[PDB]
């Protein structure tokens, strides 16, 4: 079991900004980070599978990157329904970690 | 009239059922004339991107013996085969070197390979404890352990059977469709070169 | 594939809680099924996973043995007993299938199934 850390939760950006959400682990895992969008009072939803690979059924404003321990999500251009919270999931080994953080 | 003899690319390309990804059938090819014109047509084979030598010069600067491989992979993994990109299928099943001569051939096989009932006879690897050098195969099927503890036995948590399957129902669109990649390798080892293209008149 | 689950449960401490979720639509008993806690003032948290075909269970850190998870593949229902409740241990609970590996016929479904509950 290894923990993960993110950026601090104070991200506030307007429509049309570059987003550089970081997510870092403590052991050299290959690409297994996922990212989940959560709205208040609603079930979560996947956005990208693992590193760059992107889930079907979503607009293509999302991107992900990372090969070692540093992992990044990038929004190309913001949207009116961007107000959410984004979570990292470890995968790979089973005890896992949910990395938390929000973007308003 | 300088009439020639051929060697079976008809077995290499027009075979009935190809091999899997993890154990790809390496075929050596020697003592031919090499009619690449059938290979050169963009109407049967959609992708013919070439890296070492140009497609125009394939009937010159000819080689000792050529190596023909085979694959059945998804359409999102065809670009991955080429050198310069590392991912999940060219990192643990088939590593190409940085500089090599010879080039991939990819075409769709929805009619020949996609079965509505299913096609679970294609297997690949995405977990391996080690990595790959260029050009070897891993037929062995030991259970991969993701943790410090010896898991072993049946496939539980942190035991993984390393040979996973494709799903080739025809309902899937372009991106999960079987693109039967055949990659050629050209080499110039110190020997009398005897695989060389048809000059004719 | 959908997941349904029961409503709100006992809040007063000193008791144990049964919460269960059922996979409705395409009953698959091979992929890993996980439990996720969410507090109003804290992020998501993982506690345990279950393989329904094998019955092996792996847990989180610091509360192994407090969690017991039961699987039944015949009724396609997964049960959850958690004992020794506190006042600060309240959260909204989700069950999910976030791991796309099938143990039965060697398939690895890439999407991660997008499996999530309603939330009670």
CSV table of C-alpha atoms in Angstrom, one decimal:
chain,number,residue,atom,x,y,z
A,1,UNK,CA,0.0,0.0,0.0
A,2,UNK,CA,1.4,3.4,-1.1
A,3,UNK,CA,-0.2,6.8,-0.7
A,4,UNK,CA,-0.7,9.4,-3.5
A,5,UNK,CA,-0.7,13.2,-3.3
A,6,UNK,CA,-2.2,15.8,-5.6
A,7,UNK,CA,-2.1,19.5,-6.0
A,8,UNK,CA,-3.9,21.5,-3.2
A,9,UNK,CA,-7.6,22.0,-3.9
A,10,UNK,CA,-7.4,25.8,-4.6
A,11,UNK,CA,-7.7,25.7,-8.4
A,12,UNK,CA,-9.9,28.4,-9.9
A,13,UNK,CA,-9.8,29.2,-13.6
A,14,UNK,CA,-12.0,30.9,-16.1
A,15,UNK,CA,-13.3,29.6,-19.5
A,16,UNK,CA,-10.4,28.9,-21.8
A,17,UNK,CA,-7.4,28.2,-19.6
A,18,UNK,CA,-4.7,25.6,-19.5
A,19,UNK,CA,-5.1,23.2,-16.6
A,20,UNK,CA,-2.1,21.2,-15.2
A,21,UNK,CA,-3.6,19.0,-12.5
A,22,UNK,CA,-0.8,16.9,-11.0
A,23,UNK,CA,-1.0,13.5,-9.2
A,24,UNK,CA,2.1,11.9,-7.8
A,25,UNK,CA,2.7,8.4,-6.3
A,26,UNK,CA,5.6,7.0,-4.3
A,27,UNK,CA,6.6,4.0,-6.4
A,28,UNK,CA,7.4,3.6,-10.1
A,29,UNK,CA,4.1,2.3,-11.6
A,30,UNK,CA,3.7,2.1,-15.4
A,31,UNK,CA,0.5,4.0,-16.5
A,32,UNK,CA,-2.3,2.7,-14.3
A,33,UNK,CA,-3.7,6.0,-13.0
A,34,UNK,CA,-7.3,6.8,-13.7
A,35,UNK,CA,-9.3,10.0,-13.2
A,36,UNK,CA,-12.9,10.4,-12.1
A,37,UNK,CA,-15.2,13.4,-12.4
A,38,UNK,CA,-17.5,13.8,-9.4
A,39,UNK,CA,-20.4,16.2,-9.3
A,40,UNK,CA,-22.1,17.0,-5.9
A,41,UNK,CA,-24.8,14.6,-5.0
A,42,UNK,CA,-24.2,12.4,-8.1
A,43,UNK,CA,-22.4,9.1,-8.8
A,44,UNK,CA,-18.9,9.3,-10.3
A,45,UNK,CA,-18.0,8.9,-13.9
A,46,UNK,CA,-14.8,7.9,-15.7
A,47,UNK,CA,-13.0,10.3,-18.0
A,48,UNK,CA,-9.8,8.5,-19.1
A,49,UNK,CA,-8.8,4.8,-18.6
A,50,UNK,CA,-5.0,4.8,-17.9
A,51,UNK,CA,-2.5,7.6,-18.8
A,52,UNK,CA,-3.4,8.9,-22.2
A,53,UNK,CA,-6.2,6.5,-23.1
A,54,UNK,CA,-9.6,8.1,-23.0
A,55,UNK,CA,-13.1,6.8,-22.2
A,56,UNK,CA,-15.7,6.5,-24.9
A,57,UNK,CA,-18.8,8.8,-24.6
A,58,UNK,CA,-17.1,12.0,-23.5
A,59,UNK,CA,-16.0,15.2,-25.3
A,60,UNK,CA,-12.3,15.2,-26.2
A,61,UNK,CA,-11.3,18.3,-24.1
A,62,UNK,CA,-9.7,15.9,-21.7
A,63,UNK,CA,-6.1,14.6,-21.8
A,64,UNK,CA,-3.7,12.8,-19.5
A,65,UNK,CA,0.0,12.2,-19.4
A,66,UNK,CA,2.7,10.6,-17.3
A,67,UNK,CA,5.0,7.6,-17.4
A,68,UNK,CA,6.9,7.5,-14.2
A,69,UNK,CA,5.4,8.8,-10.9
A,70,UNK,CA,4.4,12.3,-11.9
A,71,UNK,CA,1.0,12.3,-13.6
A,72,UNK,CA,-0.9,15.2,-15.3
A,73,UNK,CA,-4.4,15.9,-16.5
A,74,UNK,CA,-5.0,18.8,-18.9
A,75,UNK,CA,-8.2,20.5,-20.1
A,76,UNK,CA,-7.8,22.1,-23.5
A,77,UNK,CA,-10.6,24.6,-22.9
A,78,UNK,CA,-13.0,25.0,-20.1
A,79,UNK,CA,-16.8,24.5,-20.1
A,80,UNK,CA,-19.7,25.8,-18.0
A,81,UNK,CA,-20.2,22.4,-16.3
A,82,UNK,CA,-16.5,22.1,-15.4
A,83,UNK,CA,-17.3,22.8,-11.7
A,84,UNK,CA,-16.4,19.4,-10.1
A,85,UNK,CA,-13.9,17.3,-8.2
A,86,UNK,CA,-11.4,15.0,-9.8
A,87,UNK,CA,-10.0,11.8,-8.2
A,88,UNK,CA,-6.9,9.6,-9.0
A,89,UNK,CA,-7.1,5.9,-8.6
A,90,UNK,CA,-4.0,3.8,-8.4
A,91,UNK,CA,-4.9,0.4,-10.0
A,92,UNK,CA,-2.1,-2.1,-10.3
A,93,UNK,CA,-1.7,-3.4,-6.7
A,94,UNK,CA,-4.9,-4.0,-4.8
A,95,UNK,CA,-4.9,-2.0,-1.5
A,96,UNK,CA,-4.9,1.2,-3.7
A,97,UNK,CA,-5.3,4.9,-2.9
A,98,UNK,CA,-7.9,7.6,-3.8
A,99,UNK,CA,-6.1,10.9,-4.5
A,100,UNK,CA,-8.6,13.8,-3.8
A,101,UNK,CA,-8.9,17.3,-5.2
A,102,UNK,CA,-11.5,19.7,-6.6
A,103,UNK,CA,-11.6,22.3,-9.4
A,104,UNK,CA,-14.0,25.2,-9.2
B,1,UNK,CA,13.9,-14.6,-71.1
B,2,UNK,CA,15.2,-14.7,-67.6
B,3,UNK,CA,12.2,-16.5,-66.2
B,4,UNK,CA,12.1,-16.6,-62.4
B,5,UNK,CA,11.0,-18.6,-59.4
B,6,UNK,CA,9.0,-17.4,-56.3
B,7,UNK,CA,8.8,-18.1,-52.6
B,8,UNK,CA,5.6,-18.1,-50.5
B,9,UNK,CA,4.4,-14.7,-49.5
B,10,UNK,CA,1.1,-16.4,-50.4
B,11,UNK,CA,1.6,-18.5,-47.2
B,12,UNK,CA,2.7,-15.3,-45.3
B,13,UNK,CA,-0.1,-13.1,-46.3
B,14,UNK,CA,-3.1,-15.3,-47.4
B,15,UNK,CA,-3.0,-17.8,-44.5
B,16,UNK,CA,-6.3,-18.9,-43.0
B,17,UNK,CA,-5.7,-18.3,-39.3
B,18,UNK,CA,-2.7,-16.2,-38.2
B,19,UNK,CA,-0.8,-16.7,-35.0
B,20,UNK,CA,-1.3,-14.9,-31.7
B,21,UNK,CA,0.5,-11.8,-30.5
B,22,UNK,CA,2.6,-13.3,-27.7
B,23,UNK,CA,4.0,-16.1,-29.9
B,24,UNK,CA,4.3,-14.6,-33.3
B,25,UNK,CA,5.4,-17.0,-36.1
B,26,UNK,CA,8.8,-15.8,-37.4
B,27,UNK,CA,9.4,-17.1,-40.9
B,28,UNK,CA,12.8,-16.9,-42.6
B,29,UNK,CA,12.6,-16.3,-46.4
B,30,UNK,CA,15.6,-17.1,-48.7
B,31,UNK,CA,16.4,-17.9,-52.3
B,32,UNK,CA,13.8,-15.9,-54.2
B,33,UNK,CA,12.9,-13.2,-56.4
B,34,UNK,CA,10.8,-10.9,-54.2
B,35,UNK,CA,7.7,-9.6,-56.0
B,36,UNK,CA,6.7,-6.7,-53.7
B,37,UNK,CA,4.3,-5.2,-56.3
B,38,UNK,CA,1.5,-7.3,-54.8
B,39,UNK,CA,2.6,-5.9,-51.5
B,40,UNK,CA,2.9,-2.4,-53.0
B,41,UNK,CA,-0.8,-2.0,-53.8
B,42,UNK,CA,-2.7,0.3,-51.4
B,43,UNK,CA,-6.1,-1.1,-52.3
B,44,UNK,CA,-5.8,-4.5,-50.4
B,45,UNK,CA,-3.5,-3.2,-47.6
B,46,UNK,CA,-4.3,0.1,-46.1
B,47,UNK,CA,-1.1,0.9,-44.1
B,48,UNK,CA,2.3,0.5,-45.7
B,49,UNK,CA,4.4,3.0,-43.7
B,50,UNK,CA,8.1,2.4,-44.1
B,51,UNK,CA,11.1,3.5,-42.1
B,52,UNK,CA,14.3,1.8,-43.1
B,53,UNK,CA,14.1,1.9,-46.9
B,54,UNK,CA,11.7,3.6,-49.3
B,55,UNK,CA,8.9,1.7,-51.1
B,56,UNK,CA,10.3,2.9,-54.5
B,57,UNK,CA,13.8,1.4,-53.9
B,58,UNK,CA,12.5,-2.0,-52.7
B,59,UNK,CA,13.6,-3.7,-56.0
B,60,UNK,CA,17.2,-2.6,-55.4
B,61,UNK,CA,19.9,-2.6,-52.7
B,62,UNK,CA,18.7,-6.2,-52.0
B,63,UNK,CA,19.3,-8.3,-49.0
B,64,UNK,CA,20.5,-11.7,-47.7
B,65,UNK,CA,17.3,-13.2,-46.2
B,66,UNK,CA,14.2,-11.5,-45.0
B,67,UNK,CA,12.1,-12.1,-41.9
B,68,UNK,CA,8.3,-12.1,-42.1
B,69,UNK,CA,6.3,-11.9,-38.8
B,70,UNK,CA,2.6,-11.9,-38.1
B,71,UNK,CA,0.0,-10.4,-35.8
B,72,UNK,CA,-3.6,-9.9,-35.1
B,73,UNK,CA,-4.0,-6.7,-33.1
B,74,UNK,CA,-6.6,-4.0,-32.6
B,75,UNK,CA,-6.7,-0.9,-34.7
B,76,UNK,CA,-5.5,1.3,-31.8
B,77,UNK,CA,-2.3,-0.7,-31.5
B,78,UNK,CA,-1.1,-0.6,-35.2
B,79,UNK,CA,0.7,2.7,-34.7
B,80,UNK,CA,2.3,1.3,-31.6
B,81,UNK,CA,4.3,-1.4,-33.5
B,82,UNK,CA,6.5,1.2,-35.3
B,83,UNK,CA,9.8,2.3,-33.6
B,84,UNK,CA,9.7,5.4,-31.3
B,85,UNK,CA,6.5,4.6,-29.4
B,86,UNK,CA,6.3,2.5,-26.2
B,87,UNK,CA,2.9,1.4,-24.9
B,88,UNK,CA,1.3,-1.8,-23.8
B,89,UNK,CA,1.6,-4.2,-26.7
B,90,UNK,CA,5.0,-3.2,-28.3
B,91,UNK,CA,6.6,-3.0,-24.9
B,92,UNK,CA,5.9,-6.5,-23.6
B,93,UNK,CA,5.1,-8.6,-26.7
B,94,UNK,CA,7.1,-7.2,-29.7
B,95,UNK,CA,9.9,-4.6,-29.4
B,96,UNK,CA,11.2,-3.1,-32.6
B,97,UNK,CA,14.7,-1.6,-32.6
B,98,UNK,CA,15.5,2.1,-33.2
B,99,UNK,CA,17.1,1.5,-36.6
B,100,UNK,CA,16.0,-1.4,-38.8
B,101,UNK,CA,15.1,-2.0,-42.4
B,102,UNK,CA,11.7,-3.5,-43.4
B,103,UNK,CA,8.2,-2.3,-42.8
B,104,UNK,CA,4.7,-3.1,-41.5
B,105,UNK,CA,1.6,-4.0,-43.6
B,106,UNK,CA,-1.8,-3.6,-41.9
B,107,UNK,CA,-5.2,-4.4,-43.3
B,108,UNK,CA,-8.7,-4.9,-41.8
B,109,UNK,CA,-10.1,-8.4,-41.4
B,110,UNK,CA,-13.6,-7.9,-40.2
B,111,UNK,CA,-14.9,-10.5,-42.7
B,112,UNK,CA,-12.2,-13.1,-42.0
B,113,UNK,CA,-11.6,-12.8,-38.3
B,114,UNK,CA,-14.5,-11.1,-36.5
B,115,UNK,CA,-16.9,-13.8,-35.4
B,116,UNK,CA,-20.4,-12.8,-34.0
B,117,UNK,CA,-20.3,-15.8,-31.5
B,118,UNK,CA,-16.8,-14.7,-30.5
B,119,UNK,CA,-13.0,-15.1,-31.1
B,120,UNK,CA,-11.3,-15.8,-27.9
B,121,UNK,CA,-8.4,-17.7,-29.5
B,122,UNK,CA,-6.2,-14.6,-29.7
B,123,UNK,CA,-4.1,-13.9,-26.6
B,124,UNK,CA,-1.6,-11.2,-25.6
B,125,UNK,CA,0.4,-10.0,-22.6
B,126,UNK,CA,0.2,-6.8,-20.7
B,127,UNK,CA,1.8,-7.8,-17.4
B,128,UNK,CA,5.5,-8.9,-17.3
B,129,UNK,CA,7.9,-8.5,-14.4
B,130,UNK,CA,10.8,-7.9,-16.7
B,131,UNK,CA,10.8,-6.0,-20.0
B,132,UNK,CA,11.7,-6.8,-23.6
B,133,UNK,CA,14.8,-6.4,-25.7
B,134,UNK,CA,14.2,-6.2,-29.4
B,135,UNK,CA,13.0,-9.4,-31.1
B,136,UNK,CA,12.2,-12.2,-28.7
B,137,UNK,CA,9.2,-14.2,-27.8
B,138,UNK,CA,7.8,-15.2,-24.4
B,139,UNK,CA,5.8,-18.5,-24.7
B,140,UNK,CA,6.0,-19.3,-20.9
B,141,UNK,CA,2.9,-18.6,-18.9
B,142,UNK,CA,4.0,-18.3,-15.3
B,143,UNK,CA,1.6,-16.4,-13.0
B,144,UNK,CA,2.6,-12.8,-12.6
B,145,UNK,CA,3.0,-11.6,-9.0
B,146,UNK,CA,2.3,-7.9,-8.4
B,147,UNK,CA,3.3,-7.8,-4.7
B,148,UNK,CA,6.1,-8.7,-2.3
B,149,UNK,CA,4.2,-11.7,-1.0
B,150,UNK,CA,4.3,-15.0,-3.0
B,151,UNK,CA,0.7,-15.2,-4.2
B,152,UNK,CA,1.0,-18.3,-6.6
B,153,UNK,CA,-1.6,-21.0,-7.2
B,154,UNK,CA,-4.9,-19.9,-8.7
B,155,UNK,CA,-5.4,-16.3,-10.1
B,156,UNK,CA,-6.4,-14.3,-7.0
B,157,UNK,CA,-5.6,-10.8,-5.9
B,158,UNK,CA,-2.1,-9.8,-7.2
B,159,UNK,CA,-1.9,-13.1,-9.1
B,160,UNK,CA,-2.4,-12.4,-12.8
B,161,UNK,CA,-2.6,-14.9,-15.6
B,162,UNK,CA,-0.5,-12.9,-18.1
B,163,UNK,CA,-2.3,-14.1,-21.3
B,164,UNK,CA,-5.4,-12.0,-21.8
B,165,UNK,CA,-7.9,-12.1,-24.6
B,166,UNK,CA,-9.3,-9.9,-27.4
B,167,UNK,CA,-13.0,-9.7,-28.1
B,168,UNK,CA,-13.9,-9.6,-31.8
B,169,UNK,CA,-17.7,-9.3,-32.1
B,170,UNK,CA,-18.5,-7.4,-35.3
B,171,UNK,CA,-20.6,-4.8,-33.4
B,172,UNK,CA,-17.4,-2.9,-32.4
B,173,UNK,CA,-16.4,0.0,-34.7
B,174,UNK,CA,-13.0,1.0,-36.1
B,175,UNK,CA,-10.5,1.0,-33.3
B,176,UNK,CA,-11.2,-2.5,-31.9
B,177,UNK,CA,-11.3,-4.3,-35.3
B,178,UNK,CA,-8.6,-6.8,-36.1
B,179,UNK,CA,-5.8,-5.3,-38.2
B,180,UNK,CA,-3.6,-8.2,-39.2
B,181,UNK,CA,-0.2,-6.6,-39.1
B,182,UNK,CA,2.6,-8.4,-41.0
B,183,UNK,CA,6.0,-6.8,-40.4
B,184,UNK,CA,9.0,-7.5,-42.6
B,185,UNK,CA,12.6,-7.2,-41.6
B,186,UNK,CA,15.5,-6.7,-44.0
B,187,UNK,CA,19.1,-7.6,-43.1
B,188,UNK,CA,22.4,-7.3,-44.7
B,189,UNK,CA,24.6,-9.9,-43.0
B,190,UNK,CA,27.9,-11.0,-44.4
B,191,UNK,CA,26.7,-13.6,-46.9
B,192,UNK,CA,25.9,-13.9,-50.6
B,193,UNK,CA,22.6,-12.0,-51.0
B,194,UNK,CA,20.0,-14.0,-52.7
B,195,UNK,CA,16.6,-12.4,-52.0
B,196,UNK,CA,16.5,-9.8,-54.7
B,197,UNK,CA,13.7,-8.3,-56.7
B,198,UNK,CA,12.6,-9.1,-60.3
B,199,UNK,CA,14.3,-6.9,-62.8
B,200,UNK,CA,12.8,-8.6,-66.0
B,201,UNK,CA,13.0,-6.4,-69.1
C,1,UNK,CA,-24.9,-3.2,-16.6
C,2,UNK,CA,-26.4,-1.4,-13.6
C,3,UNK,CA,-25.9,-1.6,-9.8
C,4,UNK,CA,-28.8,-1.2,-7.3
C,5,UNK,CA,-28.5,-1.0,-3.6
C,6,UNK,CA,-30.6,-0.4,-0.4
C,7,UNK,CA,-31.5,2.8,1.3
C,8,UNK,CA,-30.3,4.5,4.5
C,9,UNK,CA,-29.3,2.4,7.5
C,10,UNK,CA,-28.7,2.6,11.2
C,11,UNK,CA,-26.9,5.7,12.4
C,12,UNK,CA,-26.7,5.2,16.2
C,13,UNK,CA,-23.4,3.6,17.3
C,14,UNK,CA,-22.7,0.3,19.0
C,15,UNK,CA,-24.3,-1.7,16.2
C,16,UNK,CA,-23.2,-3.4,12.9
C,17,UNK,CA,-24.4,-2.5,9.5
C,18,UNK,CA,-25.6,-4.7,6.6
C,19,UNK,CA,-25.5,-3.0,3.2
C,20,UNK,CA,-25.8,-4.9,0.0
C,21,UNK,CA,-25.7,-4.2,-3.7
C,22,UNK,CA,-27.0,-6.2,-6.7
C,23,UNK,CA,-25.7,-6.2,-10.2
C,24,UNK,CA,-28.8,-5.9,-12.4
C,25,UNK,CA,-28.5,-6.4,-16.2
C,26,UNK,CA,-25.8,-8.8,-17.5
C,27,UNK,CA,-25.0,-10.7,-14.4
C,28,UNK,CA,-21.2,-11.1,-14.3
C,29,UNK,CA,-19.6,-12.9,-11.4
C,30,UNK,CA,-15.9,-12.7,-12.4
C,31,UNK,CA,-14.8,-9.1,-12.3
C,32,UNK,CA,-13.6,-7.5,-9.1
C,33,UNK,CA,-16.2,-5.6,-7.1
C,34,UNK,CA,-15.1,-2.8,-4.7
C,35,UNK,CA,-16.5,-0.6,-2.0
C,36,UNK,CA,-15.9,3.2,-1.9
C,37,UNK,CA,-16.7,5.6,1.0
C,38,UNK,CA,-17.3,9.3,0.6
C,39,UNK,CA,-17.6,11.8,3.4
C,40,UNK,CA,-19.1,15.4,3.0
C,41,UNK,CA,-15.8,16.9,4.1
C,42,UNK,CA,-13.3,14.3,2.8
C,43,UNK,CA,-12.6,12.5,-0.5
C,44,UNK,CA,-13.2,9.0,-1.7
C,45,UNK,CA,-11.8,6.0,0.2
C,46,UNK,CA,-11.2,2.3,-0.7
C,47,UNK,CA,-11.9,-0.5,1.8
C,48,UNK,CA,-12.1,-3.8,0.1
C,49,UNK,CA,-12.6,-5.9,-3.0
C,50,UNK,CA,-14.3,-9.2,-3.7
C,51,UNK,CA,-14.1,-11.8,-6.5
C,52,UNK,CA,-17.5,-13.5,-6.8
C,53,UNK,CA,-16.4,-16.6,-8.6
C,54,UNK,CA,-13.5,-17.4,-6.2
C,55,UNK,CA,-14.5,-15.8,-2.9
C,56,UNK,CA,-11.0,-14.4,-2.2
C,57,UNK,CA,-11.1,-11.0,-0.3
C,58,UNK,CA,-8.5,-8.3,0.0
C,59,UNK,CA,-8.9,-5.4,2.4
C,60,UNK,CA,-7.5,-1.9,2.9
C,61,UNK,CA,-5.0,-0.8,5.6
C,62,UNK,CA,-5.7,-0.5,9.4
C,63,UNK,CA,-9.1,-2.2,9.4
C,64,UNK,CA,-8.5,-5.7,8.2
C,65,UNK,CA,-11.0,-7.9,10.1
C,66,UNK,CA,-13.4,-5.1,10.9
C,67,UNK,CA,-14.8,-5.5,7.3
C,68,UNK,CA,-16.5,-8.7,6.2
C,69,UNK,CA,-17.7,-9.0,2.6
C,70,UNK,CA,-19.9,-11.9,1.4
C,71,UNK,CA,-20.5,-12.8,-2.3
C,72,UNK,CA,-23.3,-14.8,-3.8
C,73,UNK,CA,-23.2,-15.4,-7.6
C,74,UNK,CA,-26.5,-17.3,-7.7
C,75,UNK,CA,-28.7,-14.3,-6.7
C,76,UNK,CA,-26.1,-11.8,-8.1
C,77,UNK,CA,-26.0,-9.9,-4.7
C,78,UNK,CA,-23.0,-8.8,-2.7
C,79,UNK,CA,-23.3,-8.3,1.0
C,80,UNK,CA,-21.3,-6.0,3.4
C,81,UNK,CA,-21.1,-6.3,7.2
C,82,UNK,CA,-19.2,-3.5,9.0
C,83,UNK,CA,-19.1,-3.6,12.8
C,84,UNK,CA,-18.0,-1.2,15.6
C,85,UNK,CA,-19.6,2.0,14.3
C,86,UNK,CA,-18.6,5.5,15.4
C,87,UNK,CA,-20.3,8.8,15.0
C,88,UNK,CA,-17.5,10.1,12.7
C,89,UNK,CA,-17.5,6.9,10.6
C,90,UNK,CA,-20.6,7.9,8.7
C,91,UNK,CA,-20.3,8.3,4.9
C,92,UNK,CA,-22.2,7.7,1.7
C,93,UNK,CA,-21.4,4.3,0.3
C,94,UNK,CA,-20.9,3.1,-3.2
C,95,UNK,CA,-20.1,-0.3,-4.8
C,96,UNK,CA,-18.3,-0.4,-8.0
C,97,UNK,CA,-16.5,-2.6,-10.6
C,98,UNK,CA,-13.4,-0.5,-11.3
C,99,UNK,CA,-11.1,-3.3,-12.3
C,100,UNK,CA,-11.7,-4.7,-15.7
C,101,UNK,CA,-10.0,-8.1,-15.4
C,102,UNK,CA,-12.1,-11.3,-15.6
C,103,UNK,CA,-10.7,-14.3,-13.9
C,104,UNK,CA,-12.9,-16.9,-15.6
C,105,UNK,CA,-12.2,-16.8,-19.3
C,106,UNK,CA,-9.1,-14.6,-19.3
C,107,UNK,CA,-10.7,-11.4,-20.7
C,108,UNK,CA,-9.6,-7.9,-19.7
C,109,UNK,CA,-12.4,-5.5,-20.5
C,110,UNK,CA,-10.7,-2.2,-21.1
C,111,UNK,CA,-13.4,0.4,-20.1
C,112,UNK,CA,-13.6,-0.4,-16.4
C,113,UNK,CA,-17.4,-0.9,-16.9
C,114,UNK,CA,-18.3,2.6,-15.5
C,115,UNK,CA,-20.0,0.8,-12.7
C,116,UNK,CA,-21.4,2.9,-9.9
C,117,UNK,CA,-24.3,3.0,-7.5
C,118,UNK,CA,-27.0,5.5,-6.8
C,119,UNK,CA,-25.6,6.5,-3.4
C,120,UNK,CA,-27.3,6.1,0.0
